[PDB]
UniProtKB/Swiss-Prot annotation, chains A, B, C, D:
Domain Ferritin-like diiron: 6-155
Identification of the protein by name: Ferritin, middle subunit
Keyword Transcription: no
Keyword Ribosomal protein appears in the UniProt entry: no
GO molecular function term, any single one: ferroxidase activity
Organism: Aquarana catesbeiana
Top EC category: oxidoreductase
Reactions mediated catalytically: 4 Fe(2+) + O2 + 4 H(+) = 4 Fe(3+) + 2 H2O
Phylogenetic lineage: Eukaryota, Metazoa, Chordata, Craniata, Vertebrata
Record-linked InterPro entries: Ferritin, Ferritin-like, Ferritin-like_diiron, Ferritin-like_SF, Ferritin_CS, Ferritin_DPS_dom
Length: 171, 171, 171, 171
């Protein structure tokens, strides 16, 4: 094994690789949402840029897991980044709903990884997840939920004026 | 009695203690409104922060009465701060209506205290209320009334777009 | 349940509400100590301001729990804020002793909440308590203990000169 | 009568003259206390300067009454400024006790004047007293009371070390 490796279970190393892939998958889904809202027949540029920013955030999350893997003496193993579930995202409300579910999926994987780290008695990995991922995840989920509440209030999906107003005053 | 005490009636001392409690009660009601508008299923953050600010204002009012009591040689006596009348506040219009009534309740108590001070021939207490409370109270009541008129104009409670617009352009 | 809610046990939600109340209770006790030391027949203004600052600190702790509750999709439920155990606080030593016991009471509640969070496998709540409460609590307890040792050294409660010196050189 | 005179009762004009004299009397008493604490066999220079400052404050109060009298069309009438009640002031505690009683005497005269103004339906004179005198009077009485409490705590009159400490840390 690696000269630096200490208290790092094989199961955790593997789960970190899977988590890295999931972050990349989330990044790619957000990239797709960006492209959709940038379409001339959708044209909600502030919404598009919100999703573009989130795409970059998730890529940063993945890169941080790569650095982590090496810090612990694990080995980064990459798999295909699957294309997003949809090619088009309907409207701001549908996209935000998809984003909420994606964020809860990523959150569940983080929590599962934390449970594994706990079971394997790895406090460094626990600390890493708590300090670098779990709170940002809760914050993002709350932001998206807040947005969804406001989009519903604004009459989405039917109310195009409401959709315009959201893009101009919320993002 | 206190070495500093001069022209300070026992009834006024007691009424100052009751007034202090009422300010704390008002603070707590506003805290509740803050928490409500911060909910993910309510999500009107500018409205929430308006009420949070008012919560702090009312706490400051209470602290000023504590300092006053001691300046006159009276003794601060605290009672329980009762929880607010409601656990949830409906919407921006219902909350503002509740805030207006709360402010008029606090105003009536200030005016009653001023009448007591007048009856007991206490010009210092009269001056204190006039200079530190009565005008801020009138200003706050006018602001909230103005808000209510605008919320009605915007179609509250039914018009969610109107509610969004208020949060984005009035607070 | 709330659209944002994930891995948040009902027992933890309820315990957060109780913790919030306890912080408000601690705030109110410190407010009482402030008013006491501000009395013309007590007149230890640096001591009074120490307790006033702590009163504001505890209110901030409570507000942070409100924000937390909403972030997790729980619902803030308020109860009466009970008046402090005493109406007068004796002297600097008695007040500091009461403050130490209050701080240990608040600390025990935080630790109990952390244990509940651990049992319910909620690392986000664990992190929150560790990062935002538990160390400040230990620091405050140590500061107050240090003060008590010094007040005893200075001959409290009997030595009024010692009490004056503390107010002028320690706070 | 004066071309400017309006709603200014002869009794109020006379009472303003008496009030002016009392302020000058208070100034002179404080001047005496200054000189006493500046003595080589007393030598508490911070205490001396406190009383010197108060002497100037009271002279300013008197001058403001002169300006007031003329503003209303009354006529300033001066009488002898009586020498202070004592030629020597014992110690810091005795002097502060004398200062407290002097301040309460001045306060009573202000309150009596306010009552006269009220009876004669003179709101300008009421406002003047409330805005320029009554609160400063309450503040000064509280400060002196606080000092007395601390001087007693420090073991005055017997405890010379306590007296030294007060001069060095309270004024
Ligand atoms: Cl290992
Ligand atoms: Cl180990
Ligand atoms: Cl292993
Ligand atoms: Cl792997
Ligand atoms: Cl890191
Ligand atoms: Cl694959
Ligand atoms: Cl999807
Ligand atoms: Cl599709
Ligand atoms: Cl998903
Ligand atoms: Cl896992
Ligand atoms: Cl562990
Ligand atoms: Cl984080
Ligand atoms: Cl929002
Ligand atoms: Cl929004
Ligand atoms: Cl009285
Ligand atoms: Cl009177
Ligand atoms: Cl009375
Ligand atoms: Cl009372
Ligand atoms: Cl004030
Ligand atoms: Cl009660
Ligand atoms: Cl109500
Ligand atoms: Cl309710
Ligand atoms: Cl009300
Ligand atoms: Cl009253
Ligand atoms: Cl009056
Ligand atoms: Cl005001
Ligand atoms: Cl308005
Ligand atoms: Cl608009
Ligand atoms: Cl408005
Ligand atoms: Cl849950
Ligand atoms: Cl879970
Ligand atoms: Cl549950
Ligand atoms: Cl509860
Ligand atoms: Cl926080
Ligand atoms: Cl209760
Ligand atoms: Cl106690
Ligand atoms: Cl008591
Ligand atoms: Cl306790
Ligand atoms: Cl608990
Ligand atoms: Cl856990
Ligand atoms: Cl902390
Ligand atoms: Cl210390
Ligand atoms: Cl110390
Ligand atoms: Cl006239
Ligand atoms: Cl008239
Ligand atoms: Cl006349
Ligand atoms: Cl005259
Ligand atoms: Cl003036
Ligand atoms: Cl004469
Ligand atoms: Cl005398
Ligand atoms: Cl003499
Ligand atoms: Cl006198
Ligand atoms: Cl008079
Ligand atoms: Cl009048
Ligand atoms: Cl004044
Ligand atoms: Cl003092
Ligand atoms: Cl002092
Ligand atoms: Fe980032
Ligand atoms: Fe992520
Ligand atoms: Fe994310
Ligand atoms: Fe932990
Ligand atoms: Fe941590
Ligand atoms: Fe304020
Ligand atoms: Fe108020
Ligand atoms: Fe108010
Ligand atoms: Fe607009
Ligand atoms: Fe703080
Ligand atoms: Fe606390
Ligand atoms: Fe505390
Ligand atoms: Fe002055
Ligand atoms: Fe004066
Ligand atoms: Fe004076
Ligand atoms: Mg090797
Ligand atoms: Mg392996
Ligand atoms: Mg495929
Ligand atoms: Mg953190
Ligand atoms: Mg006494
Ligand atoms: Mg009484
Ligand atoms: Mg009840
Ligand atoms: Mg004013
Ligand atoms: Mg829902
Ligand atoms: Mg529950
Ligand atoms: Mg009770
Ligand atoms: Mg820390
Ligand atoms: Mg003429
Ligand atoms: Mg005349
Ligand atoms: Mg004579
Ligand atoms: Mg004033």
């Amino acid at each position: 094994v690696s000269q630096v490796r200490q208290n790092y279970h094989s199961d955790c190393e593997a789960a970190v690789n899977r988590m890295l892939n999931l972050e990349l998958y989330a990044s790619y889904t957000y990239s797709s949402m960006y492209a959709f809202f940038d379409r001339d027949d959708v044209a909600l540029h502030n919404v598009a840029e919100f999703f573009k920013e989130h795409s970059h955030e998730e890529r940063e999350h993945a890169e941080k897991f790569m650095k982590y893997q090496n810090k612990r003496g694990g080995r980064v193993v990459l798999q295909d980044i699957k294309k997003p579930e949809r090619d088009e995202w309907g409207n701001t409300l549908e996209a935000m709903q998809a984003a909420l579910q994606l964020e809860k999926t990523v959150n569940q994987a983080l929590l599962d990884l934390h449970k594994l780290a706990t079971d394997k008695v790895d406090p460094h990995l626990c600390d890493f997840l708590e300090s670098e991922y779990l709170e940002e995840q809760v914050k993002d989920i709350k932001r998206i939920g807040d947005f969804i509440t406001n989009l519903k209030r604004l009459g989405l999906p039917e109310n195009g004026m409401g959709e315009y107003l959201f893009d101009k005053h919320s993002v």
